[model samples]
Target: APELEATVIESLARARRALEQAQKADGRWLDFRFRFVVGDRDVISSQWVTAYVGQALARVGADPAVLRRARDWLKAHAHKEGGWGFSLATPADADSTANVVHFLSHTRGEPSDEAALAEACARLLHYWDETEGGFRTYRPAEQPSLDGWASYPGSSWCDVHLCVSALAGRVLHAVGAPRHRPVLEACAHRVRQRQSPEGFWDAYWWHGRTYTTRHAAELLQLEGDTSGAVARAVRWTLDTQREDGGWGNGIGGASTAFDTALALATLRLDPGPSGAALRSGLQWLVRTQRPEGDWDSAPLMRMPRPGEHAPWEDPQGCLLLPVLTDRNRLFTTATVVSALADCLE
Candidate 1:
């Protein structure tokens, strides 16, 4: 309905203001934090979260100054190896680095920004696993340990994650770097082979089934893959959407603004038969927007306990106990804006 579209645009405008308010004085947005179930007690915000929000805001034409501040913060804090860590106090990882690089690709960056991106891309390449044909989350040589330095005691630090691979592949393509073509091809092939028979890719670093599928489908769309993977994933997403129009964390999970926004964002990539789905999802977001101009936080990240690597791989099923949600609502709200704002264009 015309009224619903107007409401979503207004909701997005309110969300933009809230996101700016949630940003730190130093120009970064990182208030969300959580400790692992069996790990350290210290809590800290993450570069990955900041980069994720920055990328979302940039896609919807956020204020250039706001984005520049985030870009500068990311560049200044980059590990000497040219990649970013999950937090400023951690070591460089492919997933965090890919997110920051992807965020930079959306901005009109400066000389230093361009230089940082070039270096970061190389650092991302350093995490590539030739045999697996995918990028590792952490250093490929690192072993899963329970030391103080490790965030999750038993989590696999060196294994390839499908979502991370998709993010890296999308960043390489977005930056238009020709030298990374071979790695990109391998990444594409790995993603194609990993999709489950059910059409969705299982989660690794993330919590829900939808998040990884969104990233994978986006990558497949970007790679121009005609193997029917994108269509299958899209169909799965459309089928899993709740009757109220928003999506839940999983099939039969409660509808949440975060999951709903992600579903809408993914469906927008290939809207051939998703017109109704997009409309309903958008309406759901508009209706759910709080009076304070943000959406309620939901579990969006996961830190597996000892030996729970690839937790969803078990027939016994996965657990959501050790999870991370953006309590401050900035991350969720920014994501909603990114998805809804795109529809306005």
Candidate 2:
């Protein structure tokens, strides 16, 4: 246990330092390697990525001034309508806005923060899809057309995806559960409705089920769910963990640090039952950390063409024509830092 403890501490320090080094001059986590393909092609900077890294650092007890710089960047560049998008240049979307709100909630709660939270919640609520019983990435009415593109059916915008809704719900809970009760209830309903009979939730925007499943479990925990949804998710996650003592994109898939980090983070939320699983994962992470203090990169986010089979689900049948992935090492390392930090707690 002492050796494991040493490794965990060492891994956390290395990863946190690497993540801090990746921060941009403008106080954002720049992923110049990828862009959001859904709306604006010109969008080169991702606000959500910055928020994600910012929150990760905050969770791991990073320097106050470091978090302040990230918070200032988000506040300064937020859309004029009080939300954020996949990138600074793109139109606001629910996922990005929700993540930014979540990140800000972790920071210094000044009056300005309160005002921004209120405005952001308002803008995020606009992305709710009443018919779908969940939140869409973009408000359908104002969404740009993806004409001739292999986008999701019917709606030109991203539909009521489980990951987005769960994220929105969690942030809503973080900001204020009482005032956002109705939206939270709706999200819970959709989450329960979409969960597969086998206990996994299919992802729409992300690469695999772990990301969506993890977030859904978190939302369920925040919502005080007693319907066994979280239990079922935990079971599925435990059962699917790879032989390498880590998780992959899907069942029986090769282990990758990205999915492993996501799964470990989710399991740590229920540490009592997940102790053994968490240990194996932590060991795997400690063993896998690169000499440069990063994990091997995996495409955590994916963009699949309509009707195309996902590569993780069916490699041979999958189409490779237009699918894209945000294969960045900095994001993966940030995720590891967050997961390891939670594990240490």
Candidate 3:
């Protein structure tokens, strides 16, 4: 019992340190309020970086000033309808709004402005289509056809990611609202129903089964279905991992550090025999760390064009070749870093 407790404490400590490092290196707090009336406004990746930094701080038991700042930025950009869009200043889109709500909910302690939060909650509830489980990616006014935009035709990907959507659900649950529970349940059901026969979920963002499967499995566990689909998803994730302890698109080569990090996080609840894979991935990350402590997986951070959603389908449409920037890199890096800390402890 003592050993298990110690392991948990150590894992927490390692995760805290990794988060602190990520916050310091990648986090930025914007001062100006985000305006929603815009064309080509400031939608820097820093907002996301700041949010993750806040999450990291919370994990480490530190004060959340940086995280609060990130929340403020998100709030400033909040659309009147309770969602967020591509930029803080642009009108709120359902996808971005969901993301913003999820991040803000993760902030430690009650918000400084309860009324504002209440308004946001109201907006989310109002926009939610009770009939269907999923949130429309954008408001009908912005994109009328978005209501039916689940997965692209002939694709394995669902319009929603289990992890991201679940995160939003958790945030709503944290806010003490039971009405959203049904919505959350619907999303969870969709995740379960969408699993491929091969034991993976097709991601709308990529061709990789591993990436989507890992997140979906994690969501299943979060939803308290760990024994059935979650277990299968985890097994598929473990089996697909490369000998080097990483997972990636079949066509794209392996980057053990990044892929393994995600896999480890998904499998953290039930590590099973995946310890070696986790360790190998951690070793790669630590060995590859730059003097400044940043891992230079430039290719992994590149952003596809607004129109070009998934890389596997259309590589030419990718805007930045061989350069993974702030948010993109930070998302993978933060997860990997947290996994490494979990292993070291």
Candidate 4:
């Protein structure tokens, strides 16, 4: 048992080093940009990776060099409009901008953080949908509710994922921007109404993946939904967990670090029948971590391109599959380190 404990601590250290080691001097992870693999072209996103990894590393006390660099990059890219895009040149979106503010607001009141947080909150509000009553990938309602036939099978552009509003709600509270509180409360109600009986939401883009479900719980908790939604989610999660104590994009998928981290962090929020699963999930992560401290996995955010129309699922539409990838080692490792570092003991 001591040997296992030693192994987890060692893995945490390795994971921290791996995250620091991968930081680009520009204060970003600089998306792996696996051009010519899916869309077969090069597209990189500093705003995207910087926000996600920066939050993960900051939570775990990663080097100030890493946190400061990441924070600076996020602020610089905040754009005059109060949003960030998938890339610097790509313009801003609600999801991209919200992710940055979510972490920065948590930085806990630096002199300038409030203004930045205020501005980012207002910017995200521009994309808020009064009709549907939540945030969107962009303004003007991209998919108009997380229901019905989506245009693209695996693309996240279609519906509003729970992360969109969840981050928005957290950022709003952190910034003291009470003007949007009423608006966000309405949005929260809609999202709450959207929860499925099975404790899942299509997330349309991610298509009902467990992490998306995990995020919904987070959003509900943030909105003060103390209504049993989280309990249902935890139970649904228990029903779907792999025997190895990890999770996949969805049920019956390979247990990988990305979704496993989501499951771990989500359950960690309010675990009940979740203690055994949490311990095993942590063990699975410690064992599956590569010798170098990274976990092989896919990116959490998947985007379907404009002109491409090839559907990923089988023809009968009987089975929708999760996209797997080997290119997210940097992001994946950072995420795992965030989840495991604090609780590994």
Candidate 5:
């Protein structure tokens, strides 16, 4: 499917250069702060981004010094329990653990580090929620009692916490491989069960619904779930496509690099509409993508700027992360890289 097009090649090169520039000496790429507070304090978790960006980098077969540092950081940071958490507040959290384990599964780590990474992967499995078929964002010390867990709909109900199910599915497939087939399958079923009639699923943590919707499809597709539910989700994405052949950050807000890119990724997965829509979306990318490989101000997930209508808050169901201008571009560049590199298998 490689068009061998000039823009795609240029897009790929720009993404690589931008990624290289984002790397720190520690081999981490923390374009935006993954902030959280536990025990009444905020923790800026750097590794979360580093591991995430590292995973994206590895997808491109990066063998740079930055990649080497990222590997070393993971090797050095493996929790005693074989998981990871916010560097400042090491909770036995699901998302952080999932991110690192997913990255490690793909990393061709050193012989000495391989065993440690395996141990980490095994530790990651223990965090799975037995009753829910999805992972919960809970630490061991804070894990809710069975009665308590049931009372919270998000923890136990399929309708809520759909994103958790997808992330868990991704990590389960990554680290468990075929060793934990049933778990992954069950997670897929949960995602399907929770999917809305609108052909979209909701996600979490400052993440917009559009991103969450795309992610659910991506996760199900990763596990080889090509059922009607998945197809409907694709159709929903296509239906939401902006008239300009791109999708806005939030539904109908305006087009954005992140939202449009994600929508295109899902759109490319199926033989949906006329190639006209897809062609327009790609052309939108060609026109708006910055010369240095960035797609431009994404305006999602960024904090409210100083002077504007006070920093814009993220919409609950529409996708947009409100990330800053340049960092948003880095995030956008990485996503466009993956979009250009692969499609639904």
Candidate 6:
């Protein structure tokens, strides 16, 4: 108990320092209020950051007031369909909704309003195409088409990171909803059956594969499969460590800060010789830090030209020309600060 108490104190001190620095840089005190709030598109990163802050605060013995504000922010933006959206101003998006639901389930216990949670769950269930065994990325009320990318044969996007189906099932499990189990199990079964024999699942976002062998392994573990799949996936992840001490591509490419952080976190969960890779990645991140303590600029937040769509959506319109000023600096700064905090751990 003494050791646990000490660890809690140390973690709180470190997290508090990092959070304070982030606030000072932005010149604000409110946890939910940021000067650079983007309107209505699904801003997934914000939800994750908030989740981190909430957890960090709880670790440090912060009062319930801190958590109450965070909860209020989430509730204020809940979609009519029972989930939350990326943009606080917009309707709820399925992907963002799934993520928010997952975060809330973990952080706030169940929603205070069960009707709202159930409605949101129902909306997602309606979108589920049983034949394909996954839900669509967005609901028709929001976007008619399936966002093009998330649409697969079974679902729109069949990436490993598309954890919506899993999140939905997990929520149902937590709520003791028996009907939701078969639905969730079906999606999981589809993923496992379709997974590559080599134990890798390709991602749609960065055009990468997520060492999903680990994800599958974890799923198997949860399903009570203690055989070779779990061990194989874990071994594959451990062996994939690069000489520089970072895990290289699940789909093959240069190491990125996001992937490195996620991979390190995953390795931490599995317990293995991941120290070399984790340490190397952390050291590299530290060395590359700018004087302002932020990481590199995000490619997503760069402004687009008039009448131009996003790069992934409309590459032809991309004259490869610069359009708008980079307004995402704040978002990028927050992410870097968060990543640095994780690296320190």
Best by TM-score: 1
**Tens-digit lDDT track for model 6 on 1-345?**
344334434433543454445432222222222222345233233543444344344334444565556555656545555365444443444555554444344343355656545654665565576777765544444343333322223332322233445444544554455667777677567556655556554332222344334344445555555445555555555666655655445544455444444455445544555555555655655544445444443232222232332233443243333322123233333333333344445
For every model shown, what is its TM-score relative to the native structure?
0.90, 0.87, 0.69, 0.81, 0.77, 0.61
The TM-score, computed over Cα atoms with residue i paired to residue i, of candidate 1 is: 0.90
Q: Whole-model Cα lDDT per candidate?
A: 0.78, 0.76, 0.51, 0.67, 0.62, 0.45
lDDT of 4 by residue, 6-106 (tens): 87788888988887888888787776453333534555767867787777787777787778888888877666553886676545678777778766765
Which prediction has more favorable lDDT, 2 or 6?
2
**For model 5, which pairs clash?**
300-321, 300-322, 300-323, 301-321, 301-322, 301-323, 302-322, 302-323, 304-311
lDDT by residue (1-345, candidate 1, tens digit) is: 788777877888888878877777777788567654555654566677678788888887878788888887887777776378768666678888888878888754578767777877777888898998998787732543343344343446557888889778878888887888888878888888999887788767667787778778788888899999988888888999999988997844699998988888788877999999999999898888898889998877776543567766641345434467788887788778878876777
Best by lDDT: 1
Candidate 4: minimum summed lDDT over ten consecutive residues — where? 307-316
**Which parts of model 4 are misplaced by more than 4 Å?**
1-7, 32-41, 80-82, 140-163, 173-177, 304-326, 341-345
lDDT by residue (110-147, candidate 5, tens digit) is 77556755666666666566676766554434354332
CA deviation > 4 Å runs, candidate 5: 1-4, 34-43, 79-82, 89-92, 108-116, 140-160, 174-176, 250-252, 272-274, 297-328, 343-345
Off by over 4 Å in 6: 1-64, 88-91, 107-120, 141-163, 166-179, 211-217, 248-252, 272-345
Clash numbers, per candidate: 0, 0, 6, 3, 9, 10
- What is the full ranking by lDDT, best candidate first? 1, 2, 4, 5, 3, 6
Q: For model 6, what is the C-alpha lDDT against the true structure?
A: 0.45
Distance from true location, Cα of 45 in model 4, Å: 1.7
Q: Which stretches of candidate 2 lie over 4 Å from their true place?
A: 32-43, 141-153, 306-325
Q: Native-vs-model 1 lDDT?
A: 0.78
Model 6 lDDT, residue 222, Cα:
56
Determine which window of 10 residues in candidate 1 has minimal summed lDDT: 144-153
Cα displacement (angstroms), candidate 6, residue 49, comes to: 6.3
**RMSD each, Å:** 2.8, 3.5, 6.5, 5.4, 6.6, 7.6
* Order of candidate numbers by TM-score, starting with the best: 1, 2, 4, 5, 3, 6
lDDT of 3: 0.51
